[PDB]
Design a protein around this ligand. Structure first.
Ligand code: NA
Length: 121
């Protein structure tokens, strides 16, 4: 049907917008702290602490399968990246501090993405 096609075109254009958001977020992480999964071969106790690991490469895989149906879903995964880091690592560490700074800088990016998603429909 044409109605199904229109919903597909909408999902594709959301995917386009979320790609640009993901690139912008990732630019706020030049050290690439959040680029790849934590390896269970080097924080071997990681999964006893953190139930839902998340990272930018994992988000990019989901995005390329048009796997985010709305901005809220994408935001949830970004918040997992930040929140997991703030739990596992102490307040005095480079990792925790990098998560704080990414959250603050990412706030700006996400704020405008919400207005664009709402405005375009
Ligand atoms: Na902690």
């Amino acid at each position: 049907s044409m109605e199904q096609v229109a919903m597909e075109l909408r999902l594709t254009e959301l995917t386009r917008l979320l790609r640009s958001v993901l690139d912008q977020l990732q630019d706020k992480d030049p050290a690439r702290i959040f680029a790849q999964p934590v390896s269970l071969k080097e924080v071997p106790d990681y999964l006893d602490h953190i139930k839902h690991p998340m990272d930018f490469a994992t988000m990019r895989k989901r995005l390329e399968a048009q796997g985010y149906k709305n901005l809220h879903e994408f935001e949830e995964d970004f918040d997992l990246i930040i929140d997991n880091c703030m739990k596992y690592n102490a307040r005095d560490t480079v990792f925790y501090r990098a998560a704080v700074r990414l959250r603050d800088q990412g706030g700006v990016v996400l704020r405008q993405a919400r207005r664009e998603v709402d405005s375009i429909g």
